[PDB]
Amino acid sequence: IQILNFTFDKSVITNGVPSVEFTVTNENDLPVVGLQKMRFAAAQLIPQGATGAGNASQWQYFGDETCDVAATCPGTFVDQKNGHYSYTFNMNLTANAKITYNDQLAQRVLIRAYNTPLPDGTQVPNSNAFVDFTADTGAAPTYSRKIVATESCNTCHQDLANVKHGGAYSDVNYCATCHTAGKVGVGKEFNVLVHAKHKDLTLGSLESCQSCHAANDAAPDWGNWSRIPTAATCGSCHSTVDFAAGKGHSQQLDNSNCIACHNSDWTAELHTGKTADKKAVIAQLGMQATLVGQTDDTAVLTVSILDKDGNAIDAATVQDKIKRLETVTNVGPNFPIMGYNKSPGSGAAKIAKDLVKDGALQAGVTLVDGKLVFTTPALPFGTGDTDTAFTFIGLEMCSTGTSLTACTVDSATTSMKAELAFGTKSGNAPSMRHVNSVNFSTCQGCHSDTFEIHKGHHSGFVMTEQVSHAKDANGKAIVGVDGCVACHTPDGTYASGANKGAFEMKLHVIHGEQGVIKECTQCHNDFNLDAFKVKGALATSAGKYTTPITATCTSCHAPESIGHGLENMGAIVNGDYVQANQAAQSETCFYCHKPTPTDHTQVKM
Ligand code: HEC
Ligand code: HEC
Ligand code: HEC
Ligand code: HEC
Ligand code: HEC
Ligand code: HEC
Ligand code: HEC
Ligand code: HEC
Ligand code: HEC
Ligand code: HEC
Ligand SMILES: [Ca+2]
Ligand SMILES: [Ca+2]
């Protein structure tokens, strides 16, 4: 009813005719009786090297038959009324026009169970199953082609049904069997197509082979990614090489020699080297910062560089290697009151100060006890949350390989661990933004753990435990994105609302247009709806403001699409600063809306 579990009991080829017997149960192992529509496919696997030295294993797709109990069925389908079924193909494999059936080769039968309901009305989910067997005894074959696991693709896609063919196939093994030479066109074989669909994408985790190639119990042949080099497969990314013509490479007329030069150790290390280089550079320094508010409302910022063990070092040791040490200071971690530009409320803009640029100290920056010190302009310190000033800090070093090097004109650079510091004018404990609803760990599956956020026009920010100030239910440090509000203020970024700069909207906007984002749980462990109590209005266009719940939901929902309207609910859409802020705690949305990350559309009627 929710899950279909297929357990195969007998799978053989009898004089060229494939036959399969299997049992179907649901999630709680209850027999499923009365299945109505299923498609059966047959294939066989050419072993590694069989078509030529160095050639990969290769599926041969005999074809498929669709069985509808209420209509046509080419084969013989038997419902034994206890959860056990049998299907005997109409096909004889010896009669295949393109493939030479060989009863010594490993065989495979695949099943797609359609979502046709049982006769009593019970709903059936679309399902995939497959079995691998030797033709005569039906036992497990001695060779296979299980390289990638559906779980790896699901890290980004959640369900492979989303990517092609109207949701028919959710098991990657089903894709890899059909996507083979002789069935799809040249270039559509799976060892070529998936490379070509990702090699030109910016998403961070795709820069590593391990995003699809890792150890998995469902993928015994997973090591083939470095051990089976082939002209077609390696050339799927190296598309400008012509091995037959010897262009961009010595001439290779076949695959017989690739592995003699391209041993798996070398292939693995050279494709994992840049990521491993970046990790070795990032591990080399840390940062500890302090922020102390003064009587004249200025704030003293002290930044100490640490070594790999966490011990402070004299910042002059590494100064000539610092490309940019970037700091941003704001007030009010739970709702910043300094805009990116001057706020309509405080009249104050965030303090953006580089401490070091191209190895040179900047104005007002001094070395004291090997630490970096800078005094900010006067800040709009106030009561409550506005007693706390906070600074988000990025550090970009010049690097080569696994080492920090002095900065030159064309030097490569690496973003280091970002730092987040808090301070007060009163001297009481600082306030801090909530982090209990967005955990940066959920970002790393798509973006990797070396996400250099805003590398390019900024120093770059790598989010680690270095910015953590809370622990989760299991005592593990929470890495939050709360530092980002230093620039993503309620008043926007540089366009003062025209780009919906506020962090409450910014990630919804940029991800609302991405197909791989489909559920709130891809970033949310929870919703902190209480945080709206401490929010004012957000700038949703240049100089115009919107009550905070409405501003958040309208990141993705056009305001006019909300049928019940917003005037009756206490909200203001692109109004005056004071007007919108006056109505900020008048929104009635949560009297009816009870969103959870799993289903945020829940309403109390
Ligand atoms: C994150 C690092 C990903 C992993 C792991 C896998 N895929 Fe992917 N895929 C990803 C992105 C960002 C895109 C761009 C298209 C989009 O807007 O989503 C894709 C694209 C594809 C496609 C192209 C057709 C499509 O539906 O987009 C295919 C056929 C595809 N992906 C399949 C696929 C398979 C089989 C994977 C496991 C081997 C897999 N993807 C992993 C992101 C990521
Ligand atoms: C046979 C029953 C198939 C299975 C199972 C899967 N695919 Fe498929 N796909 C198939 C064909 C015949 C074609 C047309 C290509 C041709 O030879 O003319 C496709 C097409 C695609 C494409 C687009 C190809 C391109 O644009 O270059 C993609 C990206 C694709 N298929 C991906 C894909 C995935 C992710 C599958 C598992 C969910 C999958 N295919 C299964 C045949 C069959
Ligand atoms: C997979 C479903 C993702 C999750 C989980 C997260 N992000 Fe994402 N993000 C994803 C895609 C496909 C894109 C488009 C850009 C691309 O590389 O294709 C983005 C975009 C961003 C950006 C834009 C700037 C950039 O570097 O591209 C940022 C800053 C960003 N995402 C941050 C981010 C955060 C903080 C996440 C956890 C809360 C997160 N992403 C998760 C895919 C996915
Ligand atoms: C997901 C987007 C992938 C990324 C990232 C990388 N590879 Fe891949 N690879 C992927 C698929 C879906 C397949 C085909 C699996 C099948 O059953 O057909 C492959 C295959 C290979 C192979 C061939 C293995 C063989 O024929 O036995 C090799 C040698 C290979 N991949 C190498 C490789 C490298 C070096 C990568 C990083 C640079 C890499 N892959 C990334 C999917 C994905
Ligand atoms: C010894 C004579 C080799 C044989 C046989 C094969 N390869 Fe090769 N290859 C070899 C070297 C010394 C290099 C350069 C390595 C470097 O770090 O500079 C290469 C290069 C490649 C590449 C990358 C090409 C590029 O990036 O422009 C690929 C994709 C490649 N080789 C694949 C490959 C294949 C498929 C082979 C069998 C047909 C093969 N190599 C054989 C050395 C040798
Ligand atoms: C000031 C130095 C900033 C810091 C700190 C952060 N961001 Fe930023 N970001 C900044 C500007 C001026 C802009 C362009 C205008 C706009 O608001 O869109 C951005 C943009 C983004 C985006 C949108 C995609 C893009 O154009 O890059 C995203 C998704 C984004 N920023 C995310 C983000 C995160 C997660 C941050 C904390 C690690 C962060 N930004 C900090 C300026 C600044
Ligand atoms: C990652 C790309 C996200 C996706 C997917 C969704 N949300 Fe989100 N949300 C994200 C960030 C970075 C923030 C800001 C955190 C902060 O400190 O300000 C938010 C915030 C919200 C809120 C505010 C309440 C809170 O917990 O802070 C709400 C109510 C919210 N987001 C709703 C929401 C819904 C309904 C989503 C699915 C459609 C959803 N978010 C996805 C990042 C991401
Ligand atoms: C992008 C990350 C979104 C945010 C932020 C919010 N919603 Fe959403 N919503 C989103 C999608 C992609 C969908 C499904 C497609 C559709 O547009 O219907 C929804 C759906 C809803 C629904 C149910 C559909 C309906 O017609 O009522 C509701 C009731 C809903 N959304 C409400 C809602 C609220 C109250 C939000 C702020 C807390 C909110 N959404 C944010 C995308 C996104
Ligand atoms: C009870 C009277 C509600 C109040 C108060 C608010 N919302 Fe609502 N909303 C309610 C229901 C039962 C539905 C679903 C019916 C529909 O026509 O969609 C909605 C719908 C939304 C949506 C999605 C609209 C769509 O996608 O078609 C959004 C984005 C939304 N509601 C937001 C929202 C806001 C911002 C509110 C406070 C200003 C608010 N709702 C109050 C019920 C009720
Ligand atoms: C897609 C991703 C692929 C796949 C399928 C192959 N390679 Fe590799 N390769 C790829 C990239 C993006 C780079 C640049 C370095 C990196 O960022 O990882 C390389 C580099 C190489 C090199 C380095 C030397 C050179 O480029 O001349 C070699 C020798 C190389 N690639 C060979 C190679 C082999 C043998 C492959 C099949 C096992 C192969 N590549 C596949 C991206 C990709
Ligand atoms: Ca810290
Ligand atoms: Ca803006």
Author numbering: 46 to 650
What text comes from the article?
Here, we report the atomic structure of an outer membrane spanning protein complex, MtrAB, that is representative of a protein family known to transport electrons between the interior and exterior environments of phylogenetically and metabolically diverse microorganisms. MtrAB is proposed to span the outer membrane and provide electrical connection between the catabolic electron transfer network within the cell, and the electron dispersing MtrC outside the cell (Edwards et al., 2018). Within this complex, the ten heme MtrC is the cell-surface module required when solid-phase minerals serve as terminal electron acceptors (Coursolle and Gralnick, 2010, Hartshorne et al., 2007). The Gram-negative Shewanella is one of the most studied bacterial genera capable of transferring electrons out of the cell to solid-phase Fe(III) and Mn(IV) minerals in order to support anaerobic respiration (Beblawy et al., 2018, Edwards et al., 2018).
To aid initial model building for the Mtr complex, an X-ray crystal structure was obtained for a soluble form of S. baltica OS185 MtrC (MtrCsol). The structure of the monomeric MtrCsol was similar to that of MtrC from S. oneidensis MR-1 described previously (Edwards et al., 2015). MtrCsol consists of 4 domains: two split beta-barrel domains, domains I and III, and two α-helical domains, domains II and IV. These domains serve as a scaffold for 10 bis-His coordinated hemes arranged in a “staggered cross” formation (Edwards et al., 2015). The three MtrCsol monomers within the asymmetric unit of the crystal displayed domain I/II movements relative to domains III/IV. These domain movements centered round a hinge region formed by residues 289–300 located within the alpha helix linking domains II and III. The location of the hinge point suggests this range of motion would not be restricted in the Mtr complex, giving conformational flexibility to MtrC.
